[PDB]
Amino acid sequence: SGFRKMAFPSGKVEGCMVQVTCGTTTLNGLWLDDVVYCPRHVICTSEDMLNPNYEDLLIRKSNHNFLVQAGNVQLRVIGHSMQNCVLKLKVDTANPKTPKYKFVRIQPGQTFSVLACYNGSPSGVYQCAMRPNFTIKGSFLNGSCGSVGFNIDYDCVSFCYMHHMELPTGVHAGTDLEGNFYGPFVDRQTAQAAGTDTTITVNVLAWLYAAVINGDRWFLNRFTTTLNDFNLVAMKYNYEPLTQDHVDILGPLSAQTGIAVLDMCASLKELLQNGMNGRTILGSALLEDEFTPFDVVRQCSGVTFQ
Amino acid sequence: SGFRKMAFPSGKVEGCMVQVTCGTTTLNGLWLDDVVYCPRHVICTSEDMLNPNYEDLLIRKSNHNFLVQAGNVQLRVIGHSMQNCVLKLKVDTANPKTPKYKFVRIQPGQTFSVLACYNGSPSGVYQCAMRPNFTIKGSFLNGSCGSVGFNIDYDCVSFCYMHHMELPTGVHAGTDLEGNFYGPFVDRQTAQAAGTDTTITVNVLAWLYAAVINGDRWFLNRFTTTLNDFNLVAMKYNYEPLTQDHVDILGPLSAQTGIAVLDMCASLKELLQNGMNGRTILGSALLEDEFTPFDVVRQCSG
Ligand SMILES: O=C(N[C@H]1CCSc2ccc(F)cc21)Nn1cnc2ccccc21
Ligand SMILES: O=C(N[C@H]1CCSc2ccc(F)cc21)Nn1cnc2ccccc21
Ligand code: NA
Secondary structure, X not given: OOOOOOEOOOHHHHOOEEEEEEOOEEEEEEEEOOEEEEEHHHHOOOHHXXXXXXXXXXXXXXXXXXXXXXXXXXXXXXXXXXXXXXXXXXXXXXXXXXXXXXXXXXXXXOXXXXXXXXXXXXXXXXXXXXXXXXXXXXXXXXXXXXXXXXXXXOOEEEEEXXXXXXXXXXXXXXXXXXXXXXXXXOOXXXXXXXXXXXXXXXXXXXXXXXXXXXXXXXXXXXXXOOHHHHHHHHHOOOEOOOOHXXXXXXXXXXXXXXXXXXXXXXXXXXXXXXXXXXXXXXXXOOOOOOOOHHHHHHHOOOOOOO | OOOXXXXXXXXXXXXXXXXXXXXXXXXXXXXXXXXXXXXXXXXXXXXXXXXXXXXXXXXXXXXXXXXXXXXXEEEOEEEEXXXXXXXXXXXXXXXXXXXXXXXXXXXXOOEEEEEEEEOOEEEEEEEEEOOOOOOEOOOOOOOOOOOEEEEEOOOOEEEEEEEXXXXXXXXEEEEOOOOOEOOOOOOOOOOOOOOOOOEOHHHHHHHHHHHHHOOOOOOOOOOOOOHHHHHHHHHHOOEOOOOHHHHHHHHHHHHXXXXXXXXXXXXXXXXXXXXXXXXXXXXXXXXXXXXXXXXHHHHHHO
8 A cells, every 4th residue: 555656667768868968068868779869959059049040050060069978988979860859869889778668749647757867867766747738847957958758668668758948937848759849839948838737637536546445435425427517617626627538548447446437526526625624635635636547557456445 | 946756766776676486475585796685574474474483484495495586587596594584595696787785774754765566576666754653655565575765875776675564554664674674563463553653854844945945935934943942843743853963954955045944943833833824835735754955955956
């Protein structure tokens, strides 16, 4: 029992982190087979960032302008290209520690582990969700660009995030590993701000199901709701709409606990109305929305504590 | 910016996790050089676990009764002995991935990363504190025994915890790597319970400093206090006493933010007396006590 924000073991990713330097700018790169992936803004100076012309900046670079360092060893760059907002540096050595991997672009609400890295050296690992407003609430300092987010379902690492920037509200924006930004964000210093964020309803429900599994029933009530009435109330608390897809996805947790999804929705409605009245749910005084239905099944017993 | 419960990268520990099987019991072991460390209760059945005589149970075992699996490979056990509550299985192969390491015993209040494992396969990493009552609020299912806790202090892994049991309140108990329990717990089926826990004051103050560093300032006030007056308030709210050692340890954060420790204690005093009045700190409605001063500096500066 217990319930923790748990990250995937980071070792398969640690073996892929390198340092990339262009000019005076150093950040992190991901070394998979014979390619190093990093944010294209590594090629920018101070001035460049207001209105960078990346094509023009890049055409002026040779391979040997890119210094790649893997632990103690310099890797030799033998090619470069730009894909969307990532630079792909072809190097002369395949990474012998390359894991089984794939690139996946995630949807808002999905969770992943972040390996925070500085100078190509990993510092820490923590669990994050893609917010409805396409930001992440990370922990990142200057030098963290090129840090990656991932899941490891089985022995296969699914890379889903590369860190590019911190927005003015202190939350974080980045790309998939094909270099496409999550959200409306650009790798340019302009006025861009996170949209108003909402709570990830499907995840809160999953976590309520986790609390029941772990032996906790105080917040249930005798009521049900229609989906549309649930969504009319939810939206007033800045909760994301719940779709029929979300109801379907919660089906297994519904079976394990014997509580229908719209009955759990009725419980959530009442929690939003009443608060917790000095109680906690799985150690929290707030409703948690960074555990997915999949994450609850991964972590929780399939025997509920009745 | 941002502040997260952050674990150490687990790679150096992942390469040391193995599966140990004795009879019908399978759990996790730690393979360092040519020794595999695991909980001695691996040798017990259900009935044995009521009143085990470990010395007697062990002397009846042969090396070949211990099946050790490192991924796909069987290791051959060539010796066995016990140190306190851990079993040491001498194997025929040194672990080529053995990191630089030490065994260290931690103090209540200190934090560490846990690599949770099942069948010798690492499943997840999370950050824990050793509670004042010597339990940890882990997340563990059946099969997790022998899962380990660690810190990393350069390239050196400091192993501090091995998981042995879950208590009735759903919290967890274990040993250091020399097999000495944290807390007044024994490896047998008896009635055992977590004692009443307290809040780790020095850690709450550290986290308040983290909040200020991250721009969350609403709880700062014009008042200061003394150690003695603050400690009267702590005791009332089931908080650990704050010592001069604790004040000294918070010194750096005090300098960086320009809030003296006893100034921050005046803030904490007011939070304990008045609550948060609908507000949150670093996204929390509760006061967090599982970040040490070192953890805050590490994350908010390195
Ligand atoms: O935001 C960062 N770079 C800026 C520079 C100028 S405006 C800008 C615009 C686009 C872009 F892709 C990057 C940037 N780096 N970065 C990432 N996490 C950080 C955390 C703390 C401080 C800086 C941090
Ligand atoms: O507590 C556990 N084993 C028992 C067997 C019977 S009484 C007992 C007594 C002492 C001891 F050291 C261990 C044990 N295993 N264990 C560890 N984390 C778990 C999480 C969920 C369920 C069981 C979990
Ligand atoms: Na004050």
